[PDB]
Nucleic acid binder design. Sequence first.
DNA 1: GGGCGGCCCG
DNA 2: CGGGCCGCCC
Length: 295
Amino acid sequence: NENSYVNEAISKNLVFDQSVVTKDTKISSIKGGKFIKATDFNKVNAGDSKDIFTKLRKDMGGKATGNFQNSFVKEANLGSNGGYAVLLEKNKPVTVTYTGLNASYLGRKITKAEFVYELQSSPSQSGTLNAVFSNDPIITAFIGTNRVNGKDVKTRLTIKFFDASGKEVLPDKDSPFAYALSSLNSSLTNKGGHAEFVSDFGANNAFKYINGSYVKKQADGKFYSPEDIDYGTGPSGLKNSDWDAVGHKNAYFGSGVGLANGRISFSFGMTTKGKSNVPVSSAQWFAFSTNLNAQ
DNA sequence: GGGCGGCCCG
DNA sequence: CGGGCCGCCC
Ligand code: NA
């Protein structure tokens, strides 16, 4: 019951981290979504800062007239190889295919991966979400839109791994995939703030609680910290930089572990618990990796 | 063929 | 870490 540990023995049967990214790693195709031109993505509202999260926090419904080539965005948050801006729409799953991987499951080489993103909830007027998908699959995705009502931002993500022979790599029953659900920060208070969350695990997936994590399943079904761990106003006294960093000893404060006996699938998003007037509560960075913040 | 892996080279 | 060319395999 010690902190940073799961109460079930966990093995990193799958490896999907910085070590799997090669010289050849990139997004080779994005299918099923309207592209957002980089010149449109890069504009911000009057008086806004110029960061990727602010650029995500605008309603781009009907402003997605790009193609694969001109959707390419350069932003340091994306890594040195950039990424692609895409509009997510209800019922229109977007398949991002990564090639040139050197990942591995039980020594079985994983060279390709398909990340399929499907809008589930959006608080903008258009009901759409904006996405930038990084060419680095460990940086993965930035999602957001403008907030006009109290609705969650929510996106479902299904991941399929492929070996060199093009066949899907799925787990042995006794050797589940383990993947990190990290950086689930929260500023929620009695009436303000927001939390990033994961939820809606796929069949044969399960969330595993990390001892000492503030992230647990709430009665609304989602996994988040229901109290502020970002600004120091909650009973834990925690601020974001007290735990939210890659490699931080206490990063498990905002993390869980996903375990999958089958194809990986789950949703992630942001919740204000129904409040419409919470600032900077509609854009997030969701990174997928096996960098478990647990032992 | 086109996409994608595994090569080479440098 | 770029680029090409030669595999093979959707
Ligand atoms: Na976060």
